[PDB]
Each structure stands twice: as structure tokens, then as C-alpha cells.
Amino acid sequence: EELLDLFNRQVTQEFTASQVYLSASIWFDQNDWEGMAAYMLAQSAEEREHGLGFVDFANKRNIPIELQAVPAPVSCAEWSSPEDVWQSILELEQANTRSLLNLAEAASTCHDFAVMAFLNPFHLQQVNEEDKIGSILAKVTDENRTPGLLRSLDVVS
């Protein structure tokens, strides 16, 4: 099934996202943006929890899960400012949203009511997440127009 394979790929996408966020925390910590680093660490953990929630449902529903490699994050080689990092995180959340939507489309096709119900809170959370990351990126982009200004607002926490 399309639905089985896609359900597995969703697990992989959550854990990939978790590792991309961790990469982002490392870039931030290495460049002394400790606040932004903490934010990314927290998000890394929450994406892994999403992945675990998908594994749990799959196990219950007898959807076979085979854990795939979690690829090495690559965007961290090109980041040179906070803006770059937040833009890559926005793109990551857009891609997490598209993958949930593909999954839901396959479930809709299959008349898989339980899967569609399972996905609903993640659809709504993805709305919130893309909105939050978008908002931060807009703030970052504005503040960084003045030297030092952005730093003064990582310091928060």
C-alpha cells in the first residue's frame, strides 16, 4: 500500500526534522546564540515525540514500521547568520506539512477514517508551527538590519 509506505516515510520525516533542528541548535550554540539554540533543542525533542506518536499508532493499527536511516543534516554547511538558519527551519516545516498532507490524501483515497482522524491534530499543529517560525523569521530579518540589534534580543532568554 501507498498508505503503508507513506506512513513509514512520515516517521522518517519526523526524525529527520528532529536532527535538522539539532543541527540548528549546534550552529547557534557554536555562534553564541544560546537562546535560539535552546529553542531549536526544544523543537528537536518535540519533533522526535511526533515521530514516536506515529510509531505508536502504527504499532496499534498493525502498520509495519521499518526504521530508515536518518540522513545527515546538510544545510548547516551553508548557514552564516541566524537568518539563514530560520529560513531553512521554515522550509523544513513547510516540507513536514506537505508530507502530512500527502499522507492524508492517501488515507482519504483509501477511505482510512482512523488514519485521517489521527492526523487531524498534526494538521492543526503544522498551521501553528509554520506561523510561529514565520513570525520569528520576520522578526529576525527586521532586527538584523541594525548591527548588534539581533543579539540584544536572543538575550530573551
Q: What is the per-residue binding string for its own copies in 39-58, x denoting contact by CB under 8 A? A: --x------x---x--xxx-
66 binds its own copies (CB under 8 A): yes
Closest by Cα among 102, 12, 72 to 48: 12
Q: Report if residue 123 touches its own copies, rule: CB under 8 A.
A: yes
Q: Is 144 in the site for its own copies (CB under 8 A)?
A: yes
**Cis-peptide into 157, omega within 30 deg:** yes
Q: Counting contacts by CB under 5 A, is residue 16 touching Fe ion?
A: no
User: Applying CB under 8 A, which of residues 30, 42, 91, 98 lies at the interface with its own copies?
Assistant: 30
Q: Which of 9, 29, 83, 95 binds its own copies (CB under 8 A)?
A: 29
Q: Among residues 4, 38, 65, 90, which is the contact residue for its own copies, using CB under 8 A?
A: 65
Query: What is Dmax (Cα atoms) for the chain?
Result: 55
CA distance linking residue 129 with residue 7, whole number of Å: 21
Under a CB-based contact definition with an 8 Å cutoff, are residues 29 and 151 in contact?
no
Question: Amino acid identity, residue 19?
Answer: Q
Min separation Cβ 97 and Fe ion, Å: 7
92 and 44 in contact (C-beta within 8 Å)?
Answer: no
Q: How far is the CB of 68 from Fe ion (least distance, A)?
A: 16
